[PDB]
Amino acid sequence: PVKPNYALKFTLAGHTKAVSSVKFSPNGEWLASSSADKLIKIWGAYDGKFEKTISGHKLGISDVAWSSDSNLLVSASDDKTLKIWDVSSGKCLKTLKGHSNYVFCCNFNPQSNLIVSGSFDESVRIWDVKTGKCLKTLPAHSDPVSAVHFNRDGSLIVSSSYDGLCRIWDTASGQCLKTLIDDDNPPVSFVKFSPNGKYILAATLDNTLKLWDYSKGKCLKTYTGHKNEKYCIFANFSVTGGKWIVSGSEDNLVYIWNLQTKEIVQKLQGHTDVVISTACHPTENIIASAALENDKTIKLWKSDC
């Protein structure tokens, strides 16, 4: 497969301000969206049908993340809390307090007994899901933390920051195992482990995606041609069909690259503002994209490969 054929299938409208994040449930059934409107919305992954609104944050939400069982969500808010939600009931199970500035990014570990959060307070916190207690506060960065992600066995956390660094943390000890940077120092706006945990994909605010073999400390691939100088745009590995890199862009497009050759293979037109977030469905060739204040929508795109 040299090129996918993503076509727009559904538009998920209803948020009243900028959409900040979209995530598929690990079981493929649902999509969760967060917005500056203080709301989480749940949608059918396959039909785009609205399921429910989850309210309770006092200010805008920057991020949401699912547990591995597709039952819990965690949200990160400008109100300086995370909330853990039971998605099937809508209930707030716990509020995680401790950050001193906006909570910007969050994730469960694969086991989903821990949550990791990054904040404009420049820290990374590790939380016990069962008790809601903060287990560790890491002095991770020297500017806002743009992303946090566990690797596939939960033993490592990767963080990114406007300070210019990607850092790898021992989950158990909280010790910094590695700092990655390539001699340039633009803000790092995004980071995530590959599905196997061997690679890290990072975005920098000089219009670059960077793929690290982090154990060798080597940047092996870059993906360029998109616009990203201002906003924290979420990128992905697409591995259900052809092997692609997917990202949003400040020219309102979704960009798709060949994982190996780093060539652009598709640009998806339809958003009327910056595409801040993309997600790739766990089993089907389906991309979710979400855009900022002048758009307010999520889109579902489907490909034969």
Partner: peptide
């Protein structure tokens, strides 16, 4: 340089 992002060989 072909990479594998999902398997652990």
């Amino acid at each position: 340089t072909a990479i594998d992002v999902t398997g652990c060989v």
